């Protein structure tokens, strides 16, 4: 595609403007990372329950973090912000989104339909309608076109690792999505085949295996600890044969850096 490079450059320009604040959680007086992790985990179930695209999920998480970057939110209203975000994401990415009623339904009438509709409106003001955010999922898609041959266990597993990173704001909030996606691809490739971050992609991204190292270290930890984590929605998801069961594969015990 004649624009495929332009897109990549343009996605790299946009990821910097869509960045949440680094340490927003600690000026947030009533909530924390641990409860952000419960929310996001919940969002994975809602996506599975309604057969949403993975992208809708990445989008919603971007909106939530950007919103919590400038608004204090009480714990009893956290789920409302998340549920409004998943609605906007679905409206943006899905061919036909689930009705508001269904979004009200998954909360157990913990909020009313109007409350959701007013939150949608509030989220839209705060993000000033900037909904077209680049996501780890997007860069992975671009990176996959540089694999020989196409190996779909590596694709599934790189997706899987990128989803895990949604759950924990510390540390993953301090990496751009292009970096997390690089780290996930290397790690997935390394794990299935013993291969390495290809030259084609170093040339494309200007990212050496060496500049991935800090993020690749974290993702190795995460991958290793994954069966132990409080949140398990994602592992549940990636056991499906639809993902070639990559959630079941054994992480390697060293990165060999």
């Amino acid at each position: 595609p004649d624009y495929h490079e332009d897109i990549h450059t343009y996605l790299r320009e946009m990821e910097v403007k869509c960045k949440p604040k680094v340490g927003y959680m600690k000026k947030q007086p009533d909530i924390t990372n641990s409860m952000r992790a419960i929310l996001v985990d919940w969002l994975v179930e809602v996506g599975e329950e309604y057969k949403l695209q993975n992208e809708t999920l990445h989008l919603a998480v971007n909106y939530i973090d950007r919103f919590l970057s400038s608004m204090s939110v009480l714990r009893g209203k956290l789920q409302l912000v998340g549920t409004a975000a998943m609605l906007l994401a679905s409206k943006f990415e899905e061919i036909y989104p689930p009705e508001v009623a269904e979004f009200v339904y998954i909360t157990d009438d913990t909020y009313t339909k109007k409350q959701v509709l007013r939150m949608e409106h509030l989220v839209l003001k705060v993000l000033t309608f900037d909904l077209a955010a680049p996501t780890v999922n997007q860069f992975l898609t671009q990176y996959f076109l540089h694999q020989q041959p196409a190996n779909c266990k590596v694709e599934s597993l790189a997706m899987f690792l990128g989803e895990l990173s949604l759950i924990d704001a510390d540390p993953y909030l301090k990496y751009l999505p292009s970096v997390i996606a690089g780290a996930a691809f290397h790690l997935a490739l390394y794990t299935v085949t013993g291969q390495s971050w290809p030259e084609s992609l170093i040339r494309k991204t200007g990212y050496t295996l060496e500049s991935l190292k800090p993020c690749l270290m974290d993702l190795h930890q995460t991958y290793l600890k994954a069966p132990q984590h409080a949140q398990q929605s994602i592992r549940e998801k990636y056991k499906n044969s639809k993902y070639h069961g990559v959630s079941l594969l054994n992480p390697p015990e060293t990165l060999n850096l």
Partner: peptide, 4 residues
């Protein structure tokens, strides 16, 4: 489910 409700949730925190």
């Amino acid at each position: 489910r409700r949730x925190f």
